[PDB]
Write a protein that binds this ligand. Sequence first.
Ligand SMILES: NC(=O)c1ccc[n+]([C@@H]2O[C@H](COP(=O)([O-])OP(=O)(O)OC[C@H]3O[C@@H](n4cnc5c(N)ncnc54)[C@H](OP(=O)(O)O)[C@@H]3O)[C@@H](O)[C@H]2O)c1
Ligand code: NA
Ligand code: NA
Ligand code: NA
Ligand code: NA
Lengths: 499, 499, 499, 499
Amino acid sequence: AGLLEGVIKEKGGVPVYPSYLAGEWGGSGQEIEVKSPIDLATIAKVISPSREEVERTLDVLFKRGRWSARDMPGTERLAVLRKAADIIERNLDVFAEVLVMNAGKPKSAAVGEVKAAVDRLRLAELDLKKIGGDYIPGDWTYDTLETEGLVRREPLGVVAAITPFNYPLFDAVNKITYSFIYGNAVVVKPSISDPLPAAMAVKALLDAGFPPDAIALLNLPGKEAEKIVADDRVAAVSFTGSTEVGERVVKVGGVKQYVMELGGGDPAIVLEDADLDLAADKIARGIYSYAGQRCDAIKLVLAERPVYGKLVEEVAKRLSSLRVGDPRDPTVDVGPLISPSAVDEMMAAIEDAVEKGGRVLAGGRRLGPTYVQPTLVEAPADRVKDMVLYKREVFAPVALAVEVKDLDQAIELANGRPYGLDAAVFGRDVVKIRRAVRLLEVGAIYINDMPRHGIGYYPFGGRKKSGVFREGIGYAVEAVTAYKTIVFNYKGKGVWKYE
Amino acid sequence: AGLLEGVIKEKGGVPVYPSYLAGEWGGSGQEIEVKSPIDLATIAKVISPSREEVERTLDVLFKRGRWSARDMPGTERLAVLRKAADIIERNLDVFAEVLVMNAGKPKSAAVGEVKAAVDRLRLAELDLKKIGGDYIPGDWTYDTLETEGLVRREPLGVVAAITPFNYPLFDAVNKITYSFIYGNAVVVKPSISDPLPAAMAVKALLDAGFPPDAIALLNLPGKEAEKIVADDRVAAVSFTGSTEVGERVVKVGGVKQYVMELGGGDPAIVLEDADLDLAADKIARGIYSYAGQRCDAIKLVLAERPVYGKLVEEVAKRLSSLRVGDPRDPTVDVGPLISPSAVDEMMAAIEDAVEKGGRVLAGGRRLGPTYVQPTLVEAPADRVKDMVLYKREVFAPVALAVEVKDLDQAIELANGRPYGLDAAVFGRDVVKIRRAVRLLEVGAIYINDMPRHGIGYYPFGGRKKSGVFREGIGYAVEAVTAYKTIVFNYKGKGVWKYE
Amino acid sequence: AGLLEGVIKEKGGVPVYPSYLAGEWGGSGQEIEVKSPIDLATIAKVISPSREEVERTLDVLFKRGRWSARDMPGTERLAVLRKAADIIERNLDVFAEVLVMNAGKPKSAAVGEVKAAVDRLRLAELDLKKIGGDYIPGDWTYDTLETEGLVRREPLGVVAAITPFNYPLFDAVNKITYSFIYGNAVVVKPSISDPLPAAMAVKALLDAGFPPDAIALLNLPGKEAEKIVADDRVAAVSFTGSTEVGERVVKVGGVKQYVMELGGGDPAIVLEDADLDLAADKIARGIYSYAGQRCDAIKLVLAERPVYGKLVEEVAKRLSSLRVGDPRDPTVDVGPLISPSAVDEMMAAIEDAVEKGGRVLAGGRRLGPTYVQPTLVEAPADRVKDMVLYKREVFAPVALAVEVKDLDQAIELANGRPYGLDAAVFGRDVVKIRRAVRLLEVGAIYINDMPRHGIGYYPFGGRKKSGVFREGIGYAVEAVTAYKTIVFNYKGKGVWKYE
Amino acid sequence: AGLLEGVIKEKGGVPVYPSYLAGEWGGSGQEIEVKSPIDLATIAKVISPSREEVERTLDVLFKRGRWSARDMPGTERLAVLRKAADIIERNLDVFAEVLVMNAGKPKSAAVGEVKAAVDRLRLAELDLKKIGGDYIPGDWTYDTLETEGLVRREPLGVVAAITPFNYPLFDAVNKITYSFIYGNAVVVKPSISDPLPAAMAVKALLDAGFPPDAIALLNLPGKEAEKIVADDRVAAVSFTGSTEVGERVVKVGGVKQYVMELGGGDPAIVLEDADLDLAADKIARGIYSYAGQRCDAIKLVLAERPVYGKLVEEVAKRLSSLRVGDPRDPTVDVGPLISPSAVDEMMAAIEDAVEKGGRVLAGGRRLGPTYVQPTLVEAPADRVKDMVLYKREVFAPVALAVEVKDLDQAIELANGRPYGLDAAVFGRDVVKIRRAVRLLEVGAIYINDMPRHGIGYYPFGGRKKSGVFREGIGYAVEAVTAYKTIVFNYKGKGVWKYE
Ligand SMILES: NC(=O)c1ccc[n+]([C@@H]2O[C@H](COP(=O)([O-])OP(=O)(O)OC[C@H]3O[C@@H](n4cnc5c(N)ncnc54)[C@H](OP(=O)(O)O)[C@@H]3O)[C@@H](O)[C@H]2O)c1
Ligand code: NA
Ligand code: NA
Ligand code: NA
Ligand code: NA
């Protein structure tokens, strides 16, 4: 709508969103329904591209898009991104409504994602802190004497941005931004679950001046996207999604540069000297935000004996006072999960915990096909490691609570999951904090706050099953750029006099 | 021998080299013959590890090796590497003899590789220019106000170093060095073709103090190594080899950090204003060194009309005056190719060129199962692109010569191969040079010199089919290390007064 | 005017500009006339502050201004600068008119300075590439084992910005920008000759939100400014002016951080392979722009035998076709010099050159008290070094032309002046260029272009008599900021296990 | 002796040390006695250079020394420094004996300084982390479009190293090392009080290969050194000494690059949660080491109410159990002060404190012309600020103890002195620590340890009266090096296609 007026076609029924084929919106492949977790109803359809159009798009992106993007000076590229931000911002409510509707995201969380996407675009100027190579004089070795080196980065070419359902707007804007600010062409592939926000952003970008042959948005479901990843014209693949899909992506792609943000949940550690008010408050929010559908959501809480009681009590109270329902009501604190399937898994995981010695301390009641209460399950340390909620990531509002004797047990348990994205530690003692910071095997540690990736003001990414490489203002240059080395030989030419 | 006295076991016949299993030398798997390209004779045997020993080694490297390496302070780790250099250096001739014998490398080139390996170890102190994270103050965004960030690198854990046959000693030492200087454990997997130099270096390292449970040397042939790459305890894979094997490696490994140095040959461009003496001299050497068995070997020469004649003439003269035979004779300029198979391919490729309009300008005569003359094949521009010598990398001393009308044709042809490792340009005009530097799609460009990776004083790596990521003093930190972000939240705590 | 309506007071006669005293505009000291080089007429008066007000201002800047500036978050500080840019830009013509009138600057050059000042403000976001300290792990020495370091920069406090007459608007905005973007308070002290543009910018900044107690503009003539430089509350002094005044400034200030941009002219070298059209064009402009009143103005031209003739001829033609007069006429190419005194010196210097063997090739005729023709004086190498035009900087449109036999003589002569700000070299041979780049003792070298500092997109500053330290986007952080080191001791505390 | 055999001349009596005149040892100026604080006896004489020899030395350093140093490749320069370290190390005892004798330094502290000097030389390889400029692409502004920049550092030329009496060997080696590793020539000017260690180091360097015309050691007393500082051939001045002398140095030198390490003492803050054992132990040592003759010595202790008692008690006990006397006895903990004059001042300062309400808690008794007891003087907060021991730096083993109500009072008092070199904070709460780190106006803060500059593994330097700029591995490059900018103009030349 609004910016998509000429694009969207209302074929008797729901609005139909076509793919962008690096030049023109279209698509001749199967049409696919897009539903809302609020009521399982169809709110639109997206046109997927035919194999022939995928092939043609890639050919355009490669043969022409790489140069449109690279040959547009940086000052112009940034102008494009700044303009795109302006457009998205004046269409805020429209962007947010689609998020609430398509993603089942509470109105406040939906507004937050639009603002993040706007800010990310505007702050592309900070990504520039990573522009500018290195000079390497040669007189520090006899073999390189009277030699000189210059190392600078160049865009790889065509970057494939694969996006998850839980941040349908931000992830797309984020990847497009860091790929473009450095001069790359981009193939965006959003979750078929909620691909509407991505189409809206791509249009805003095109309206803002983004080289028409340098970007693409293909509505391809799951494995049909493999055609893109495996293509040799795709020099990089920026993927945010599940460990399991990420694995398949690399196996299909083969040699290329990758950024793999594979989530998993995060553990939170509470030391005896922690401000329990802050802790309880932050931990509770970390558990339920967006119905736990945040890769940086808290899935396990670990607290030392002397504060475990209060802490768990306060968090349980907090989770209990939450209001569930339709996200539209700014009254509601928690909306629905992306699918009934996801709730099924959460219920099963809660049963498993109880059978293995676990006790629910708050929530636990399913309220509908896609509605559930944010849950907090207590578990004894000697039994938690075998619980599904521990061993795996149950993408839902549910966390385990475990009493520990000391920091070492806290750390050990925190590290015992197969993931290593972020971790949180509340407490005040520098030494204990330092210890934790060194031994927690995660990409990021939040001291006295819940894990919050934000727009990547601070880089993030995983360790272990949570992936490889980071995303962040500036740091993302490593995934979409390659080094170029220039060596000059002046031996005997008289520049230097033996040196 | 010497440092391998207690290790090597002479079971009636040839010396038998066991694998190092992160603690003790051994192996209960098939024994494999190691032959010399000088006379196809068996010079030794290596003991491959059983699946059970591979499993056990990885378990040691992971559970214990990661910590031995990480918990050894850096000052101590560097001492180890410096010591290892001392040991290899006093055993120079021994190391070189094995290179000449096992790799068919001319005595001078063999001495050069030992010296490179010694220097690489000693210069691990320069890799330290990449130690030391980033501080990120939070007041440049309202959402991060009263927040702070610290980003530092940590070793990934266990790094798998897969090595090629043409630099059997250097590549191994190089990878072990940058992996260890940053605190990682390493599984070295040398080419089964010439795994002896690697065993010698590993022993020197162990003798020097390298944590015994933090390193491994497994004599596994080709695909049996996949067991290592695919294992989850292997967090990184540093691979130097062929495009085709590299592809398989990533597909087997899945998500992990990779450095893929996939070679291919390099093109050399000669402008009308180039010093043709230097050019001819450097280009000829770039063509024949180590019998063209250098990933950075020149495979194509492009020269502007007015100098093509002289240039090709001078290079042909030079290639013609070379002496072939056994590498032992410091008289010989060119030894044998690693296998008769490699020569077969070179002969076939030369035929193909001639059939497609090509004419030999020097060499072309096979001198034995593993001996051939360094060849220079002339080809008209309108026909070279379909020639096997162009489309592929014929790992042998053979290059195509092509006359071009101008720099644009030179660049176009240079970029027309599927590889993009390095490229060379001889000439003096800044503008033409700048143009070439911008448009040549390669990891590195050598101005007025032949492509020479050396010890990585200047980083190198490929573009296109030549791979992803770089190796170099300092730059290699990106492949064996991961970022750790620490975010501190001081909101309302009184550190800052609104700012 | 416009933004200065409430500020400027028209006391029967000319407009009277008061000083800004870190809180309120005012001043109780002598009033001073401000004249225009276009007609020696008084166009305004500035109120200088009393010793008591200087003292009070410094006390405010120190006790309160340092914190207003430091405690304003960066995101807010940048907003202030961006806003200030908007204000100056909408008042462009007003800013430019005052420049043309007060500085005698040609309308186009005046518009250029306003745009530079606007751009400099807007690009303060690029100065941020220099925000963010260093982490220093301690295990690379035994004595620092189990220790850790963090190094970050902090604003020094109160920065004194002393400004020259030739870039009355830019220099002021530039210094205020880099001092403020990092959190410092600023005392601006413009040339009493043309202090009006500075007052206009300061007002725009105050209007934009600049903490009122964190900035000051004092109309103090020459030596009366010493009171500021010598004060201990002034932690830094950013000075752009003459070598001789800079010398006095440091001697008065004593220990503090300084940036000393002391100008002098620049030499231009033309090699035999240079595009003489470009060369002649750029060199001529470098000679006459703003009537040679540019610190980066060309004062000496050196060309190799074979091109000297044409080059000097083309430049002479060009200088000859220039139109002199009042700057207002967009027809005029050259306006007046800041004072008749400056012309006196130029005429004397031209006489000296001729007496010492020099011959005028273009210009030489004085056209009025403050008007002169852009001059080009030929001089034989064996006699040029004793000429006033060589030994000194004659701030006027005049340069020496000298034929040389080769690059070495060119370089030698270029380096023979007491200054070392910038230098220019036209030619195409990489080796000769490299040679020149290494041996020219200057802060900056321009290849195939005239020296052009611009807004400091590329850092600049001098060597020898041209000063110390640089100014530039990002690089200026060194002059207004100080390092803070934080060392943490964890010995025996259990963070590390021997390492 | 030993390495000074041919140099030192025993003219009937004490050994006579000549100055090194950039080529040959000598000197025709007044001879000066060098005495030992252990017994006020003359242990040697140094030959000062005549004005004519100073002039000649500078001329050599400038005309020839700059190039010997710059034209010696870095790999060779480092070899020189590594060799010099070897020589000093094998002559350890000799170096230490002279320190104990000439500086009155306890044998252990003397051995420590020799080891520091050895390590500093060997670690010059870590200074290399600061070698290698910046590439600046031009397409981020329209005015710099099709332009490019390269910024690299060059040695300034001739660096003057002025050294203090308390670290007669280290400071000299330190300054020579960072000046030389980057390619500068050096004029060393040691304290006339104890210039012997410097002569020994210079000889070791000359023996190690240091270009003979690139270094100088001039035995000039106080103000006679001004001749050096004021000379235009001296491009940099690295000075470690008193605030007052530093001030004079800059006023004499004028415009040049300076590093001013002006000391003053340091304050130590003890929070209620601090390990009082560690605190007391570190604080006591910080008070008495080298008889308080350390610029980083503790002069003021501030502890929160609840721990003040114990803390002061434990420190008093510790200071009391110290043994004073001749430094030779490894039994002695404290040797003499450099002169009786220094003790006079300490006694006067202790009287002043008592008169103003202060009470001695330990020590206070003078034991001889140059011997005193390490003292701890208690003072009430409401009266300490007017005490001489607070307002000034009494270079002796004496500190004030002051009870405070909270961190804010601690910080306020800590910041109340005119100095700002380092500061120490003992405690464990992150927030309180963070607060202190932000508000303490010093160049460096030591958390849970006494201020210890060491060899500059972590950079240090002052704020306020303690100076400007830092010294440290790597960081010192800023004081002895200058930037060189190279801008390339390719406008319309066809490198870029509009970008
Ligand atoms: N890019 C660079 O910087 C660079 C540098 C040097 C060389 N190279 C290139 O690399 C090649 C080196 O020669 P090469 O003939 O030895 O090539 P290669 O066969 O590709 O070398 C492969 C290395 O990988 C191992 N390997 C083979 N199959 C494997 C599998 N399925 N799984 C895991 N590991 C496997 C090999 O062991 P086995 O010996 O047991 O098969 C060998 O150690 C050349 O093409 C050269 O151009 C590139
Ligand atoms: Na692939
Ligand atoms: Na895998
Ligand atoms: Na002063
Ligand atoms: Na001076």
